[PDB]
Design an enzyme around this catalytic site. Sequence first.
Site, PDB file in Angstrom:
ATOM      1  CB  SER A 145      -0.982  -0.064   1.179  1.00  0.00           C
ATOM      2  OG  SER A 145      -2.097   0.802   1.006  1.00  0.00           O
ATOM      3  CG  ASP A 248      -5.695  -1.563  -5.017  1.00  0.00           C
ATOM      4  OD1 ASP A 248      -4.891  -2.379  -4.505  1.00  0.00           O
ATOM      5  OD2 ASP A 248      -6.093  -0.521  -4.451  1.00  0.00           O
ATOM      6  CG  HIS A 293      -5.506  -2.478  -0.720  1.00  0.00           C
ATOM      7  ND1 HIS A 293      -4.894  -1.863  -1.792  1.00  0.00           N
ATOM      8  CD2 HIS A 293      -5.067  -1.824   0.385  1.00  0.00           C
ATOM      9  CE1 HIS A 293      -4.134  -0.869  -1.358  1.00  0.00           C
ATOM     10  NE2 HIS A 293      -4.228  -0.822  -0.040  1.00  0.00           N
TER      11      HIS A 293
END
EC number: 3.1.1.98
Length: 347
Positions: A145, A248, A293
């Site tokens: 991330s 995503d 994610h």
Amino acid sequence: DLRLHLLLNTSVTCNDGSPAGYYLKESRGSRRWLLFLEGGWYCFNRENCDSRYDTMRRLMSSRDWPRTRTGTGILSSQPEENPYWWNANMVFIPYCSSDVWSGASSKSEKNEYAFMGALIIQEVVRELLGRGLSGAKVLLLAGSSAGGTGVLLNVDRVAEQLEKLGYPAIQVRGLADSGWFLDNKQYRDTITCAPTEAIRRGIRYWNGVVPERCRRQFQEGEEWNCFFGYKVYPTLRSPVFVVQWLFDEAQLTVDNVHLVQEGLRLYIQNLGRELRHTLKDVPASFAPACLSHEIIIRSHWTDVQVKGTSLPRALHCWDRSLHPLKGCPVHLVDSCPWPHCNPSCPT
Ligand SMILES: *[C@@H]1O[C@H](CO)[C@@H](O)[C@H](O)[C@H]1NC(C)=O
Ligand SMILES: Nc1ccccc1Nc1ccccn1
Ligand SMILES: Nc1ccccc1Nc1ccccn1
């Protein structure tokens, strides 16, 4: 378990002035080192960062950090859980700078918070060289991330750091997971509603730094461009492997998509096509047609496959390529156009 070490240089700090640090598990029979950057969004002004300090304080402070952490996924030492690098030296660097790992600003009379993410990475590397990293053959800088975008912003600086300090034999490489975003038109919290403003304001608030070749392309005031993978990646010299789900969840949240009639169907299909397009000239990449994610420190990261190849295998094939390979691919991007058209997507 990986054990906590607070930085010996206590002037390299988390947001609130407490010392930054790293968690370490040594493997003395290995010359491979994995340094993983944690994610967790960011904050971009006084009021936004104050809110984060009430309810996300571990992302701003080391005061309450635990002694130890369990390695999972690519950080696991169990071969069954980590087919790729189970014998490596393992490092987890907690994200306590709220600056997508870009900042180089101290607390002062004029600054309520310190934003030191770029300097935290430099100091961890620096202190690890006295604990065995001096003998490494490969340093893999990985992250998920915001930590994945942080890999893109910092991998070439680590490479330059080690060259200048006199360690030219250590090969620095990057692995960016779920950090490759599109500054696209939305389908319909400023950090999600107005992302490019949030980045522009953040860079000025953090004294944030971007890689020099990218900075020179876009020039003063336009540094926010270098936070987007498809714009900064072509300027990087270090080998970088890119992992990105085609649909995503963070990208869709910013785009204001919540899960379907024609307009949204066309929007979702167009997002997958555009992400695919940006990865066409990325030779080391893994991009499944799933709505998710992050992946690389999840314990079941071994399960997903693209064209019959798992992510641990693709990374092993990448290692071999840095010594096409028959039966051992490194570029794996799904072509099917809808989330979970790949049967191996996670539930
Ligand atoms: C500690 O880190 C700060 C910030 O990078 C730097 O100014 C200082 O020189 C460092 N101290 C030592 C002894 O390396
Ligand atoms: N920027 C911020 C700071 C403090 C509390 C909430 C937010 N907003 C937010 C929106 C999506 C994901 C994470 N954070
Ligand atoms: N999360 C996201 C998704 C889609 C478009 C913009 C953002 N924002 C952003 C912030 C820092 C670094 C990269 N991207």
